[PDB]
Design a protein around this nucleic acid. Structure first.
Ligand SMILES: N[C@@H](Cc1c[nH]c2ccccc12)C(=O)O
Ligand SMILES: N[C@@H](Cc1c[nH]c2ccccc12)C(=O)O
Lengths: 105, 105
DNA sequence: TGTACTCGTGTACTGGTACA
DNA sequence: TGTACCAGTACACGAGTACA
């Protein structure tokens, strides 16, 4: 059993909250897409316009191969793979994610 | 019926904005990490750490130089891509980065 | 027969060398 | 001079296959 610097949410590999404070401080206005450029490949317009499009239906249909995740977008894998959402675990904090969507509780 | 996209239309690409306003709100704590991974790019948790960290230090003066780009974590193709990064932004969006470094604020 | 999951490839990442 | 291509890593984006 090794010791741990307090509990809180960030620990072991935090190095991210210092990232959000500046990443969103720009989000307030149109300064959310100026970060998807200074990094060259951040042209994730498809990795964002198509990936968000996967939960968009995963939280409603979640049937995979039936709407248009890839026939004209991109998700077939990024929409059916969502079944593995455990990777970024939604339920852990989906509680707030649903708060801004449904969180019917 | 129609998405009405003739003039302006909603907040322009609501797909990215809906993911920005929801981010900042949860970006305050760890409610954004579930989304940054289960709805953005999760293995990118390292990519963002290294994609901005290069621009972060780029404005400072390091993380790129036949040895900083590497010691940084993967800035070589990145540090160099950082130049191409201007591609997703004609020095305008990069201007927000300066807003928190030299532009003014 | 249908559908789900897993897999493929290109390249995110990571970093080295050569060229511009 | 540093990076862009290129090499490596392992994954992402994207594809296909297998089972039910
Ligand atoms: N996540 C960034 C990673 C990146 C690629 N090349 C870069 C150059 C500089 C900074 C970041 C990057 C992106 O989407 O591209
Ligand atoms: N970058 C995320 C995007 C993604 C791929 N497949 C998904 C399935 C569901 C939700 C998101 C995704 C990932 O690699 O996982």
């Amino acid at each position: 059993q090794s010791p741990y610097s307090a509990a809180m949410a960030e620990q072991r590999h935090q190095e991210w909250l210092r990232f959000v404070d500046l990443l969103k401080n720009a989000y307030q206005n149109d300064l959310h897409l100026p970060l998807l450029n200074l990094m060259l490949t951040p042209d994730e317009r498809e990795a964002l316009g198509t990936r968000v499009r996967i939960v968009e239906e995963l939280l409603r249909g979640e049937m995979s191969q039936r709407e248009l995740k890839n026939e004209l977008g991109a998700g077939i894998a990024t929409i059916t793979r969502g079944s593995n959402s455990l990777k970024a675990a939604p339920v852990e904090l989906r509680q707030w994610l649903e708060e801004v969507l449904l969180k019917s509780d």
